[PDB]
Each structure stands twice: as C-alpha cells, then as structure tokens.
Amino acid sequence: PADFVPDSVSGMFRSHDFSYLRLRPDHASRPLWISPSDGRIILESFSPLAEQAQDFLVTIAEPISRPSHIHEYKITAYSLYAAVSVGLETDDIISVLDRLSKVPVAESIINFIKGATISYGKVKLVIKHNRYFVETTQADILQMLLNDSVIGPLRIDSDHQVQPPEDVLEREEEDDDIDAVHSFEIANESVEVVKKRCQEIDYPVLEEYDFRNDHRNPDLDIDLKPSTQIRPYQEKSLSKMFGNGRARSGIIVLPCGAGKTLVGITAACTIKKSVIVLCTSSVSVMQWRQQFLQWCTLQPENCAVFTSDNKEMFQTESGLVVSTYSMVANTRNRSHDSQKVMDFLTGREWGFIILDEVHVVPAAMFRRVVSTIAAHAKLGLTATLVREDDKIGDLNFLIGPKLYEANWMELSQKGHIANVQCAEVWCPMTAEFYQEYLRETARKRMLLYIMNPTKFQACQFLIQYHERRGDKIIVFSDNVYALQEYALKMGKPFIYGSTPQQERMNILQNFQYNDQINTIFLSKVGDTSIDLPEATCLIQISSHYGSRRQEAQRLGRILRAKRRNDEGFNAFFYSLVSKDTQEMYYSTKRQAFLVDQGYAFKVITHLHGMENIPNLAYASPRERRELLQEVLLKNEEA
DNA sequence: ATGTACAAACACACATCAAAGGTTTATAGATACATTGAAACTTTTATATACGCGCCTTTTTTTTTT
C-alpha cells in the first residue's frame, strides 16, 4: 500500500507470440539485433564489439553472460522507471533499437518501449523551494500531485516557502514526486495514507527528497562527512538519489555487510537533517558498531541505540539516531522509558530513516515501521526481492524499487567475489525409512528424509576430500534434533539453538588461526550471528522449504563479503541431495535460481573416490539397520 | 482453513560479587636467661690497746652391764 510490489519482479517485457517476428528489419540491418519484442539482447553481424556495451544493456533486461556473441536480455516495465536518473533521449534507445528493429520494428513494443520509458523521470508530485507543494514534474506521473486530494487537496495553495516551507511542510511530501504543476504547498498531516493512495491511484511518481531544498529546517543534525573510499560498485548508488529538480532516495538490493553504513553515511551527510538507523537484533546489530563504523567519516561520540537494557543516552543529543524496528515494531517494549523514547521519535518528522535487511521482516510486523517513523526519506536495504512474501505493497512505493543490483562475473573483473563451483551430491535412498515415509503424514515425514544412510558415507568423504587436498570446511545443515547427534557422531562440534551465552565463546578462540580442530556445525539462530573469514569450503546437508530463500541468502555472506583479489580463487560450494526424496525438486526449484546469478553449479552423483572412507561408523548396513532402530524413536515420538 | 517450529520481548531464576570473620603466623613486643669485663669487693699483721665467745683444751661429775 504505502509501498508497492514493484521491487522484485525482473525478467519481463518478453513480447513474442506464436507469430512474434515482423518482416525482419534487422534482417538487412545486422550490426546488432536483440530480441526486440522481448527486449532480448543479441549482437549483429555488422557489429560484434561487445565489452564496452555493458552499460547500454544495463538499461533494460536480464542477460546470460556465459553467452558467446552476447548474453540474453528482456523488457522491463519499472526498469525504464529506474533509468530516469540519466533520463536520456527516450527515442534514442528506440533509435538504438532502430538498428535493432530485428523483425519489422515493433513500434508497438517501441511504443511499449516509449511506454517502457514513460514513468521514470516523468514523475509528478509537487514541491517548493524549501518546502513541498501540490504539483507534478514529469509526464509519466505528473498528476501524482496536482489533481490529488492527499497530494492535491492534500496540496495546499500556499504560494512558495523555504522559511514558509514548514507549517504544513496530505502530510509532508518532503519526499514528494517530481514537482510543481501549479504546486500547492504541502501540509503536515496525511500522506501516511497517500503513500498508500499512490499506487492506489496508481501514480508511477518519482519521489524526490532533496539535499537542501526544505527549509522547514535550518538544516538539521547531520552534515556532510566524506572520509570514505570506494570499491568499483559504489558511486551509482550514491548519485542514484539525486535525479532532477531536487534530490531523492530509493531502495537498493545487495549482498549486505560491505560497509553499507558508509554509503548510508553519504546521503545522510548530504541532507543535514534528522535521521535514524535500524538493524535486526542485538543478536545481529553488533557486527556493525565497531569494525565497520569508524574507519569512516563520523565523529566518535554522538549516536544512541536503545534496548532499555541495551539502552543509551536518550533525551540527550540533538544529533542523529539509530534503533531497531523489532524493538518497537511491536507492543514489545522493555522499559516504559521506551515510551519516554517512543512518542517523539515516532511522532518526529525524521528527514530520513535507515532500514536494513528488512527482507525476512513481515508486513505483519513490517507495517509498524511504516506506522512508526514516516521519515521524510527512507533507506531500502535487504537481501532478496523476489521472495515468498511477494505480496502487494513492497517497500517500493515507500522508497522505490531496487536501485542498484550487485555484479558478479564481469564487473567483479574489478574485484573477485569468490569464484564458485557449486556441488550437489546425489545420494540414493533406501526404502527402509522410506517405506514408512510412505506411511507418514505432515512435515514429520521430512524427518525420515534426514534418516538416510548415504549422508554418513559421504559426510566424512567431504572432510577427507577437503583435507586430502587440505582446505578446511564450512558446513550447512538443519533440524538439530538429530543433526546435533550427527555432530558428535561426526567427531565434529555441536551447535544448537536454546543455548547460553557463555558456551558461545569456546567456539573460535583457540580455533581460528590454529590448524587442527577444523570443522564446525550450525544452528538455526547461530547463523544470525557470524561466519568465519575462513574455510570457503561450503557444504550443504539439510535445509527446509521456503527457508530456501534465506537459506540461500544465508550462504551469501561467506563469499560476497570476501574481497581479496587473487588470480584464480579456486573456491567451491558443495551440497547434500539425498536422491529419491521429496525435496530435491523443490531444491531444484531452489536450484532454479542458483546459476541464475551466474554463480554456477555442477553436479556429481558420485565423484572419483567417494568410497575411500574407512572411518565411517555404520560401515556395514546393520549398524545402518541398528540406525533403523534409532531411526524409529523420534519418528516414533512422531 | 491453520495451526507449528523459531526467535524477539519481559519479567524473572541463576551464577557472581562482596562484606564479614574464624584461623595462622610472621612478626614483632617483651622476656628471660647467657657473657663478660669491669670495678666494687675480699686478706696479713701486729700492735698494742680492752672486750667475749666459742672453741682448744681440760677437771669433775655422770652414767649401763656382769
């Protein structure tokens, strides 16, 4: 509602029917011919020079970049919406498609492309010279201010004001769209629904949140601080929040943890206003304050963070703020002095708000921040946008769709993010558990899946292989119930939820730079803390449907957060896939976007040498049939 | 429809901190011997003088067995 779904929907514009091709225009003109109606991308015989052409292709659709002449392409509806930042000559892309009119030129698609170039940069929501107003700016969304009632009748005929930009400032459209068809000064009351009304009245309107163009502020408790540096993937995001008129903001999809505070530093530094920051959990947040927050540009003293047990200095500093949603994303609240903090900052006209990895966060709890801050601008930072909660209003119509993707196979040609060759070992199955798996019921069937004799024979082989060629391991699995049994039946450490803080320390200290106790297991809450800077030998064993997304996201921090820049980087991933079992199809459906990312995958049902393992307990299958007798228990508890 | 493993509050059961105190003992006060050198102390005598007292020495009296 306030936000819009439009941030997780790539792979579109595929305009082609049972008779798509028109009289091949590019048939004669063969310098370049992408799939037009689709928006697909394909080179032409009068034109093979590719590498420099990365950017032009970046404007449209999805490639196949292990393609030879070129990679693939596609149309994208909101994709043109993103392109407005440059906002170049619209027909030029069509003019570029002029040669690329491969079939008879799909003017309809071209119009669709002209349409594909309709919204972004054609935004419409008024603003005024140190205030906000009820007008509109570009053709794509112009009326998204003027004809309105929360933007038009919620646009107030006030003439013009920077100093007069405050009383109203039908709430602060300080982040209004492109502005000023006759712009009626914006008010102070009711856009918390406008953001909902927007797509409700479906205005593809390009929000704009300025750098100094709202003098409801003698611009407030920030200031520019640029000390930072840049790896090859920054600047676009930074200038991505400028546009036309006055500045703006948006949403960006990233493998996070890359000093994303630093990019957060800039835009906040570049508005000098009131801003707050948010992260998941005192479980999660502390990987932020002090190894990647001070090599940067901020003074050492200001901010406060709040848990009323992990509390700070509140009622104290005029400067900026930082908190957690789930803290107040709920009627959860520890010390009523929280409501000594709650009321203002909630009610406070924050210039900007920072939300981070809201991906897992549900509307059923995510709407609180929507109902909490309503800051004049917002930060969009999560893991993945194609989702399971693909529901109606994603945070876009609040902030925007994804602004910057990542880049993996050919920009990382500046910085190698950990060359991957994924492995899935296709271990067959025995009916012995499986027979009563044919007798099972609700997901307590899946426990039987965990009862596979094959995992063991391979499990050590993985440990053996890794150390037979001598590189240490990081493993992935689930369902601790017996997976914990696996651990100290693997000769390897056990890790489990519902665990005291004390014991968490003994895991790493005489363990990291040592070279002997070189194996690890993972829980379902421990993954919410950290992964080692070591052992990119990545082995999946056990997972679970739906979690697949975050499970796949869970795999992310290992490699992408790594940045070392060697020649090859012979790194690999591995996984356990017990054959003839309920999940692998869903795992293939999980695999369905594995090499989507270009980070590839190779399969081995059996390698050269899996059986080389003589230390496996249950070497003969009667212990595996002893296992059957233990296999009963929990599934006889079940 | 439909509730379930999973992890955030939210106030609390759990491991920790800290004041108090018997007991031990160097550690020191005070202690009782251990040293020794040092000066305050002893001896002749004879010599008469003019004493006693006890002891040299002896005269007179005093007391058991055949």
Q: How far apart are CA A574 and CA A476, in angstroms?
A: 9
Q: How far apart are the first and last CA of chain A?
A: 43
Q: How many Å does it take to go from CA A342 to C1' B51?
A: 130
A237 touches strand B (CB under 7 A): no
Q: How many Å does it take to go from CA A370 to C1' B1?
A: 29
Experimental method: cryo-EM
Q: How far apart are CA A232 and CA A415, in angstroms?
A: 8
A158 touches strand B (CB under 7 A): no
Q: Cα A435–A436–A440 angle (5° rounding)?
A: 130
DSSP annotation of A356: E
The residue written with tokens 């509140």 in the block is A314
Encoding tokens for residue A506?
């003994």
Q: How many residues does chain A have?
A: 638
A544 touches strand B (CB under 7 A): no
Are the C-beta atoms of residues A403 and A251 closer than 8 Å to each other? yes
Are the C-beta atoms of residues A163 and A142 closer than 8 Å to each other? no
Q: Return phi, psi of residue A252, to 5°.
A: -130, 135
Q: Which nucleotide is nearest to A480 (CA to C1')?
A: B5
How far lies A476's CA from each of A520, A533, A539, A551, A583, in Å? 9, 16, 6, 9, 16
Q: Which nucleotide is nearest to A525 (CA to C1')?
A: B7
DSSP annotation of A620: S
Q: Cα A205–A207–A212 angle (5° rounding)?
A: 150
Q: How far apart are CA A544 and CA A397, in angstroms?
A: 32
Q: Which nucleotide is nearest to A280 (CA to C1')?
A: B8
Q: How far apart are CA A475 and CA A573, in angstroms?
A: 10
A407 touches strand B (CB under 7 A): no
Question: Smallest Cα–C1' distance to nucleotide B7: which residue has it?
Answer: A525
Q: How far apart are CA A222 and CA A302, in angstroms?
A: 11
Q: Whose CA is closest to A330, among A395, A281, A376?
A: A281
Q: How many Å does it take to go from CA A316 to C1' B22?
A: 51
Annotated binding site of A for ATP: 254-261
> Resolution (in Å) of the shown entry?
3.0
Q: Return phi, psi of residue A4, to 5°.
A: -135, 150
DSSP annotation of A44: B
Instruction: Write down which residues 266-305 in A have CB closer than 7 A to strand B.
Output: 281-284
A454 touches strand B (CB under 7 A): no
Q: Which nucleotide is nearest to A332 (CA to C1')?
A: B9
A342 touches strand B (CB under 7 A): no
Q: How many Å does it take to go from CA A205 to C1' B2?
A: 39
A602 touches strand B (CB under 7 A): no
What is the maximal distance between C-alpha atoms in chain A? 87
